[PDB]
Amino acid sequence: TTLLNPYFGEFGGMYVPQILMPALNQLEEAFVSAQKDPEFQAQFADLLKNYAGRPTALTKCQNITAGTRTTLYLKREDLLHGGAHKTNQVLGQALLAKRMGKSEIIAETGAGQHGVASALASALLGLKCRIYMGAKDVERQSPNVFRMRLMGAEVIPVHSGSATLKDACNEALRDWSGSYETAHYMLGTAAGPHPYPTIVREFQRMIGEETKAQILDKEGRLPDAVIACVGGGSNAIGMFADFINDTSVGLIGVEPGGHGIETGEHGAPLKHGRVGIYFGMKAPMMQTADGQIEESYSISAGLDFPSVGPQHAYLNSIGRADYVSITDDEALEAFKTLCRHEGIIPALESSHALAHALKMMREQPEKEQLLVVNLSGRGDKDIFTVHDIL
Amino acid sequence: TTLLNPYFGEFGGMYVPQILMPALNQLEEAFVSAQKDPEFQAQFADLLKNYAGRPTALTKCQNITAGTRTTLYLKREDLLHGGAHKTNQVLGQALLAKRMGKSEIIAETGAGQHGVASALASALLGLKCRIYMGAKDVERQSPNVFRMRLMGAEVIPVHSGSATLKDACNEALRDWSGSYETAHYMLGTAAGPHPYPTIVREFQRMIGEETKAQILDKEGRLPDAVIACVGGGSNAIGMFADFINDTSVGLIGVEPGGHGIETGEHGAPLKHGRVGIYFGMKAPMMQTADGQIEESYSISAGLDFPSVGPQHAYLNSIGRADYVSITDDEALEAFKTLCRHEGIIPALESSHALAHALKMMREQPEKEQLLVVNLSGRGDKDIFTVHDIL
Amino acid sequence: MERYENLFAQLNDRREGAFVPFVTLGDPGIEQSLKIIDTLIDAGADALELGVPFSDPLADGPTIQNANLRAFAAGVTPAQCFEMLAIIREKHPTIPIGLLMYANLVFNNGIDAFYARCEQVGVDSVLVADVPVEESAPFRQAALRHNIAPIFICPPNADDDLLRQVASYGRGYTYLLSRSGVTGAENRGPLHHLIEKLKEYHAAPALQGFGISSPEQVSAAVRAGAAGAISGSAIVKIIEKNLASPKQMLAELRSFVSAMKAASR
Amino acid sequence: MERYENLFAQLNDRREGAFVPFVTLGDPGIEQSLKIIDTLIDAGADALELGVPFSDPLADGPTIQNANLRAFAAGVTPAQCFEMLAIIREKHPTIPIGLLMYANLVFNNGIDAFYARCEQVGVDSVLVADVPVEESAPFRQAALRHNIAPIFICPPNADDDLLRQVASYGRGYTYLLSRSGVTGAENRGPLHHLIEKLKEYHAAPALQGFGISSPEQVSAAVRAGAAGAISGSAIVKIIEKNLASPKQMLAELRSFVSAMKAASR
Ligand SMILES: O=P(O)(O)OCCCc1c[nH]c2ccccc12
Ligand SMILES: O=P(O)(O)OCCCc1c[nH]c2ccccc12
Ligand SMILES: *Cc1c(COP(=O)(O)O)cnc(C)c1O
Ligand SMILES: *Cc1c(COP(=O)(O)O)cnc(C)c1O
Ligand code: NA
Ligand code: NA
């Protein structure tokens, strides 16, 4: 029994062991109550404004579009405290944990940004944070691991299975299965069992709300399309949400194409996977013919969730949103182009969204189009990766 | 002959070879004209808002001050595009270069932040940028050097003298001495020959203007003191300027004490140097008994300017501002404390200002005081340094 | 078929509880796993609970995580598991055989097809660890259409509505959790009131599981009103400890199962 | 004293221009530098321009940057430079000796004291490279009080007001820049109109400097109306090239200075 619908069409649900159902129901109830509580809303708004730096800028990129009929704006989540949009929702989830009387936080992380975000929120709000991270990721993300520890969080390497994000997801749920009375599981994307896809969207929806107000102020009309990368789905659903009912606005999600869809080395389950049940939800998955879950591959370590949020699978199914992919090389070219022409170093994740907008522009340069790319994070973290490739 | 006063009491002036006087006079005239031009002001304001992210937040730090009568706010220049306050003034200087019809930019850098800031501004505004950096700094700042190159700037190592910041300062002036007709010298701090100390202050003064409005909104009164680190003097004069005439507001500048003033291994020329003439100005300098210029030492590579802006020397002389020092160990402790208790990783430069506020609080915990620390930059860049020390 | 019903009736006639070991099919290889299973049966197992290696076993602690890893190292697939199940049933006609599955393996290529394959090889029940009663409709319906008992877990704190649903939805046996958390012999888990409410609602006989690793826990479960007990991690550890000595592995499995079964009398 | 006035009068009586080499005092060591200087004089130098090693010579290109580095490697200090200057004057009573200084070295321990020390050792002029006319008051006043000529640079494009100030403020000689930039023999720099305006305003005789490295440039400067030419980087390069052969260094310095001085006739 739930207060809200756990499904988006066929996708979603609450596929967790029975022992975890009370925790999900408690979380859903706390969330519905918080959404109607003006005190919770004001506290969240105050943290977003005065701690995290909202609203974030909406930057026009004239140098990149010169000579074409494309007008391109970047929603600057790269300027949010922490350097990525993840900060928005961890603040909200930390306030939910405190509303329920929880004192501890559990979080999973792949490349480490969600771990850092969870740790900073926990440090600010007096919560004891523990983060699960696949051992292969721990080895490749020393900087983020050190940040988490500076911020007082415990980082626990996970060596089971592939020792990467999905394995950390499993371990977080294993721990929660025994610790839910005292700990809240701060899931890092708009995926997992209900109510997570819903909560994460609502705690990221200010991205699209601000973008709408900003583009109306600057252009007097809505965008032709808003474009966002899709790892698990949080930055994209945060950008898309406020525009879902604006039927003229295209919603374009960009999954990582890795070395190319035909190689099988990609992270594009929405368009190139098969529906399965894993991580508490029914959604398109990267999986073997037999049903074993596989990893997503991308040059961008943050586009590693091996499935996708259920709301995206649903929006695709009804034709409201369109999903495409961008390869490692396309993303790298977009990264270089933004650095050189706008003086902004984008995260490689976000570079996937930018790359698709660049293709929209370049393929039809005399098409009049007003586009917004969600620049989900800054790319300082990726300079070593890019340097080594070049 | 000048339009504006080149001196702050005894300090300042225009001590450059005669060949460079026309460039300084031209720059001063262009600046006076720009300051009265509503179109220039609007263009600068638009870049600050929509590209760089102003206004920056003013964050209250309740966890750090718990149990004391100190209320501490942080002015969040760490959230500015680029991660430090340097971005404000390079945007303004790039607009001045374009106003004068210049197409090229020269800039010096020590730790690299000013080089990155100059490069991003130049990339955005269509200027060809070349940056001089001491070879010892180039070797220790690979990340920043790569950022500059991604942004299209030319990085030129300087091997003369100590191969560090002062040497890069000399080389920038050597180049300008032959290229001023086509290039603007984008000096990186509120120092050097007039009109630089003046221009840099005016292009950083929004820090203090915003802080004043923010603290009035949040506390209904002005701070008891505003505290800022002092390398060359730009972030501090940007915070102080709007409060100079508010006599009740203390202005506290914090120079790096390095291993301790008594060791001689520090970067605190204002309080522990001797007046000299170098880098186009008369100001307190780190120098030998014979008059040879020496380097400043600090755990923080960005507090390396071996002198200090003339306006600070002046404000000290009349007793309007007070200058103190903070050692490497004090700065490191402040860095750790902010990470752990507020989830904010501060630049080691800025950590010097924070450390002094912490001492103000801790030495007299029942003293009622409302303090603002200028958090001049983020400390992601310093995590390796800190990790290695710990 | 009615294998659980026949077993529990026989056990009740003997005033005995059921002792049901759990192992991962194919750990540490297909041949050794078939030998392990025959040894468990010969040593006194009343029924079997058998896991199919899955990439992400989120209800399992390290011991069973490592059994899954060993099986995968030997290339074990669900298809090979079903070939094993057919052979096990061909040797042992009456022992109840229950599978412990993760949802993706059941849903993957069709829920109905999965339950039909179970029926074909002679499996008696399926417990899908990550399908709560709230999501169970298609699974339980398919199980029932193919004469498979769908097994549901009763948390050590389930409320009345949940007890009624578990009693109504399940068949064969009711899985009674000893505690929160995941599988593991290192964490030991009063269940009398849950046991009574289940009997009141005419639920399938309860088998207590999680942390059962000693004879006295088997006797305690039965004394509390459960029909028996399941032990997995304690069994799997014997495999793990004796990988280099297959013979000693079988001897130690035999000794442990014999001691656990004796405690059910 | 009036050493520049006496020199220029003598040169004018002979219809000759002045050839004035520049070297960094103490490069590559005190003893070798004293030998180099005596060789420059014996080879025909009419006057000397001498730099005091400074940490940050921002008006100098690489050649003189490296001369400063060599002198520092030999531990040369301003105090040792003044001991050298006294010895040079003791050997050579009439040659005009001009210093090329950076402001901090003059201001450091007192402007007046610096000019008094120059007077004591017998220096005739001081050119402070980074003190423009606009900041020159205390320097020029102190120079004049101690019978030292303050030298000012006239840019290759100076306007009328600047020409008038340079003419009024300077003494001894007027330094005429061949071009923008910094010292260097690799970059060669019409100065006739500036030369005429200086004569109109009764400025001290002009010595052209920057990039002078060949005899034909000496003759050209003089033909243009300058009283002579200063050559630094070309001289310093001879030191740099012959560090390992002190004797060859002196021979090559002699040949170069002789050729440059001959062109002034
Ligand atoms: O003895 P233990 O603690 O290993 O429990 C073993 C119970 C059978 C079992 C193995 N894996 C599972 C996943 C979910 C529910 C039950 C199981
Ligand atoms: O022959 P060049 O080009 O080395 O010029 C040498 C002129 C003397 C000289 C040496 N260093 C200086 C700094 C400023 C002005 C003049 C000088
Ligand atoms: C984590 C991350 C992503 C991907 O996660 P989503 O939930 O799909 O948004 C994208 N961009 C950045 C900068 C990230 O840190
Ligand atoms: C460069 C820098 C400084 C020091 O320079 P000032 O001109 O003294 O402000 C301080 N903080 C940061 C973050 C810097 O990047
Ligand atoms: Na994905
Ligand atoms: Na300084």
Q: How far apart are alpha carbons B287 and D10 in whole angstroms?
A: 43
- Residues A196/A2, Cβ–Cβ less than 8 Å: no
Q: For Cα atoms C16, C20, C22, give the angle at the middle one, nearest 5 degrees.
A: 170
B51 backbone dihedrals φ, ψ, rounded to 5°: -110, -50
End-to-end CA distance of chain C: 26
Q: How far apart are alpha carbons B212 and B240 in whole angstroms?
A: 10
Residue spans of alpha helices (H) in chain B:
21-35, 38-47, 62-65, 86-99, 113-125, 135-140, 142-150, 165-179, 196-202, 206-219, 234-240, 269-272, 310-317, 328-342, 348-363, 383-389
For the sheet containing A58-60, what is the strand order? A58-60, A70-76, A369-375, A225-229, A250-258, A321-327
Q: How far apart are alpha carbons D101 and D104 in whole angstroms?
A: 8
- Residues B373/B227, Cβ–Cβ less than 8 Å: yes
Cα C261 → chain centroid: 15
- Using the Cβ of A388 and the Cβ atoms of chain B, whether some distance falls under 8 Å is answered with no
Cβ of A132: how many Cβ atoms within 10 Å?
Answer: 25
Does the beta carbon of B308 sit less than 6 angstroms from any atom of ligand 4? Answer: no
Residues 6+ apart with CB under 8 A from A213: none
Nearest alpha carbon to residue B309 among B381, B243, B231, B222: B231
Q: How far apart are alpha carbons B322 and B304 in whole angstroms?
A: 20
Q: How far apart are alpha carbons D70 and D25 in whole angstroms?
A: 10
Cis bond before residue A55 (omega within 30° of 0): yes
A15: tokens are: 């596929």
Cis bond before residue C150 (omega within 30° of 0): no
Nearest alpha carbon to residue A301 among A377, A205, A190, A191: A377
A179 backbone dihedrals φ, ψ, rounded to 5°: -115, 5
For the sheet containing C125-128, what is the strand order? C149-151, C125-128, C97-101, C48-51, C18-24, C228-231, C206-209, C174-177, C153-154
Q: How far apart are alpha carbons A356 and A376 in whole angstroms?
A: 14
Give the dihedral sign, CA A115/A119/A125/A129.
positive
Q: Packing angle between helix D30-42 and helix D246-262, nearest 10 degrees? A: 30
Q: How far apart are alpha carbons C233 and C251 in whole angstroms?
A: 17
Burial group, residue A36, by CB count within 10 angstroms (0-12, 13-18, 19+)? exposed
Q: For Cα atoms D104, D108, D110, give the angle at the middle one, nearest 5 degrees.
A: 125
Cα A383 → chain centroid: 21
Cβ of D110: how many Cβ atoms within 10 Å?
Answer: 12
Cβ of B136: how many Cβ atoms within 10 Å?
Answer: 18
Q: How far apart are alpha carbons D193 and D199 in whole angstroms?
A: 10
Helix H or strand E segment including A27:
helix A21-35
- Distance from the C150 Cα atom to the nearest Cα atom in chain A, whole angstroms: 14
Residues 6+ apart with CB under 8 A from C13: none
- Using the Cβ of A387 and the Cβ atoms of chain B, whether some distance falls under 8 Å is answered with yes
Q: Which of the 8 DSSP states describes residue A211?
A: H
End-to-end CA distance of chain A: 54
- Using the Cβ of D79 and the Cβ atoms of chain B, whether some distance falls under 8 Å is answered with yes
Give the dihedral sign, CA D109/D115/D121/D125.
positive
Cβ distance of D78 and B290 shorter than 8 Å: yes
Find tokens 């062991």 and name the residue: A17
The DSSP code sequence of A158-175 is E-STTSSHHHHHHHHHHH
- Residues B77/B235, Cβ–Cβ less than 8 Å: yes
Q: With contacts defined as CB-CB under 8 Å, which chain A residues touch B118?
A: none
Does the beta carbon of C22 sit less than 6 angstroms from any atom of ligand 1? Answer: yes
Burial group, residue B157, by CB count within 10 angstroms (0-12, 13-18, 19+)? middle
- Residues D256/D248, Cβ–Cβ less than 8 Å: no
- Residues B194/B200, Cβ–Cβ less than 8 Å: no
Amino acid at B290: D
The DSSP code sequence of chain D is --HHHHHHHHHHHTT--EEEEEEETTSS-HHHHHHHHHHHHHTT-SSEEEEPP-S--TT--HHHHHHHHHHHHTT--HHHHHHHHHHHHHH-SSS-EEEEE-HHHHHTT-HHHHHHHHHHHT--EEEETT--GGG-HHHHHHHHHTT-EEE-EE-TT--HHHHHHHHHH--S-EEEESSSS---SSS----HHHHHHHHHTTPPPEEEESS--SHHHHHHHHHTT-SEEEE-HHHHHHHHHTTT-HHHHHHHHHHHHHHHHHTT-
A301 backbone dihedrals φ, ψ, rounded to 5°: -60, -20
- Residues D92/D41, Cβ–Cβ less than 8 Å: yes
Q: How far apart are alpha carbons B77 and B57 in whole angstroms?
A: 8
Cβ distance of B160 and D65 shorter than 8 Å: yes
Chains with at least 3 CB pairs less than 8 angstroms from chain D: B
Active site residue A85: yes
- Residues D92/D1, Cβ–Cβ less than 8 Å: no
Residue in D103, D105, D155 nearest the CB of B15: D103
Q: How far apart are alpha carbons A299 and A111 in whole angstroms?
A: 12
A223 backbone dihedrals φ, ψ, rounded to 5°: -65, 155
Query: Resolution in A, one decimal?
Result: 1.4
Chain A nearest-CA residue for B152: A340
For the sheet containing B7-8, what is the strand order? B7-8, B11-15, B280-285, B274-278
Amino acid at D221: A
- Strand positions, DSSP E, chain A: 7-8, 11-15, 58-60, 70-76, 104-109, 128-134, 154-158, 183-185, 225-229, 250-258, 274-278, 280-285, 321-327, 369-375
Interface of B with D (CB under 8 A): 1, 13-19, 21-22, 160-162, 166-167, 169-170, 173-174, 177-178, 180, 276-280, 282, 285, 287, 290-294
**Closest ligand, as measured to the CA of A113:** 3
- Using the Cβ of B56 and the Cβ atoms of chain A, whether some distance falls under 8 Å is answered with yes
Q: How far apart are alpha carbons C151 and B3 in whole angstroms?
A: 89
Q: Which domains does chain C have, with CATH numbers?
A: 1-265 (3.20.20.70)
Length of chain B, please?
Answer: 390
Q: Which of A79, A120, A385 to mutate to test the interface with B (most CBs of B within 10 A)?
A: A79
In the reported structure, the alpha carbon of residue D177 is separated from the centroid of ligand 2 by a whole-number distance in angstroms of: 9
Q: How far apart are alpha carbons D8 and D14 in whole angstroms?
A: 10
The CA-atom distances, in angstroms, between C158 and each of C57, C179, C191 are: 23, 11, 11
Q: Packing angle between helix B86-99 and helix B21-35, nearest 10 degrees? A: 100
Give the dihedral sign, CA B195/B197/B202/B204.
positive
Q: How far apart are alpha carbons B113 and B82 in whole angstroms?
A: 8
User: Which residues are registered as beta bridge partners of A327?
Assistant: A258
Touch between chain C and chain D (3+ CB pairs, < 8 Å)? no
The CA-atom distances, in angstroms, between B351 and each of B116, B300, B357, D195 are: 21, 9, 10, 57
Q: Which of the 8 DSSP states describes residue B224?
A: S
Q: Look at residue A273 and give its three-state secondary structure.
A: coil
Burial group, residue A368, by CB count within 10 angstroms (0-12, 13-18, 19+)? exposed
A378: tokens are: 């800054």
A379 backbone dihedrals φ, ψ, rounded to 5°: -110, 15
Cβ of C239: how many Cβ atoms within 10 Å?
Answer: 24
Cβ of C190: how many Cβ atoms within 10 Å?
Answer: 7
Cβ distance of B150 and A383 shorter than 8 Å: yes
Q: How far apart are alpha carbons B305 and B303 in whole angstroms?
A: 6
For the sheet containing B369-375, what is the strand order? B58-60, B70-76, B369-375, B225-229, B250-258, B321-327
C239-244 contacts: CB < 8 A, separation 24 or more?
C239/C23, C239/C27, C239/C28, C239/C36, C239/C67, C239/C70, C240/C63, C240/C66, C240/C67, C240/C70, C243/C28, C243/C70
Q: How far apart are alpha carbons B238 and A228 in whole angstroms?
A: 37
**Closest ligand, as measured to the CA of B115:** 4
- Residues A104/A179, Cβ–Cβ less than 8 Å: yes
Q: Which domains does chain B have, with CATH numbers?
A: 8-52+86-204 (3.40.50.1100), 53-85+205-390 (3.40.50.1100)
Name the percent of chain A in helix, strand, coil, to the closest 5: 50, 20, 30
Q: Look at residue B104 and give its three-state secondary structure.
A: strand
Q: What does the radius of gyration of chain D's CA atoms come to, in whole angstroms?
A: 17
Does the beta carbon of D208 sit less than 6 angstroms from any atom of ligand 2? Answer: no
Strand pairing report for C228-231 and D18-24: unpaired
Q: How far apart are alpha carbons B215 and C223 in whole angstroms?
A: 70
Give the dihedral sign, CA A93/A94/A96/A97.
positive
A59: tokens are: 């930057």
Q: With contacts defined as CB-CB under 8 Å, which chain A residues touch B52?
A: 57
In the reported structure, the alpha carbon of residue B268 is separated from the centroid of ligand 6 by a whole-number distance in angstroms of: 6
Cα C26 → chain centroid: 15
Does the beta carbon of A86 sit less than 6 angstroms from any atom of ligand 3? Answer: yes
B233: tokens are: 């003097």
Residues 126-185 of D with CB under 8 A from B: 129-135, 152-155, 158, 162, 177, 179-182
3-state secondary structure chain C: CCHHHHHHHHHHHCCCCEEEEEEECCCCCHHHHHHHHHHHHHCCCCCEEEECCCCCCCCCCHHHHHHHHHHHHCCCCHHHHHHHHHHHHHHCCCCCEEEEECHHHHHCCCHHHHHHHHHHHCCCEEEECCCCHHHCHHHHHHHHHCCCEEECEECCCCCHHHHHHHHHHCCCCEEEECCCCCCCCCCCCCCHHHHHHHHHCCCCCEEEECCCCCHHHHHHHHHCCCCEEEECHHHHHHHHHCCCCHHHHHHHHHHHHHHHHHCCC
Nearest alpha carbon to residue D190 among D208, D167, D202, D205: D208
Strand pairing report for B104-109 and B128-134: parallel
Q: Packing angle between helix A142-150 and helix A113-125, nearest 10 degrees? A: 10
Nearest alpha carbon to residue A82 among A118, A131, A37, A46: A118
In the reported structure, the alpha carbon of residue A297 is separated from the centroid of ligand 5 by a whole-number distance in angstroms of: 9
Residues 6+ apart with CB under 8 A from B150: A336, A339, A340, A345, A383, A386
Touch between chain D and chain A (3+ CB pairs, < 8 Å)? no
Cis bond before residue B55 (omega within 30° of 0): yes
Cβ of B62: how many Cβ atoms within 10 Å?
Answer: 12
Does the beta carbon of B230 sit less than 6 angstroms from any atom of ligand 4? Answer: yes
B156 backbone dihedrals φ, ψ, rounded to 5°: -115, 110
Q: How far apart are alpha carbons C135 and C127 in whole angstroms?
A: 13
- Residues B70/B361, Cβ–Cβ less than 8 Å: yes
Cβ of A290: how many Cβ atoms within 10 Å?
Answer: 14
Method: X-ray
Q: For Cα atoms B34, B38, B43, give the angle at the middle one, nearest 5 degrees.
A: 80
Q: How far apart are alpha carbons B229 and B376 in whole angstroms?
A: 8
Burial group, residue D92, by CB count within 10 angstroms (0-12, 13-18, 19+)? middle
- Using the Cβ of A49 and the Cβ atoms of chain B, whether some distance falls under 8 Å is answered with yes
A276 backbone dihedrals φ, ψ, rounded to 5°: -150, -175
- Distance from the A211 Cα atom to the nearest Cα atom in chain B, whole angstroms: 12
Q: How far apart are alpha carbons C205 and C200 in whole angstroms?
A: 11
Does the beta carbon of D22 sit less than 6 angstroms from any atom of ligand 2? Answer: yes
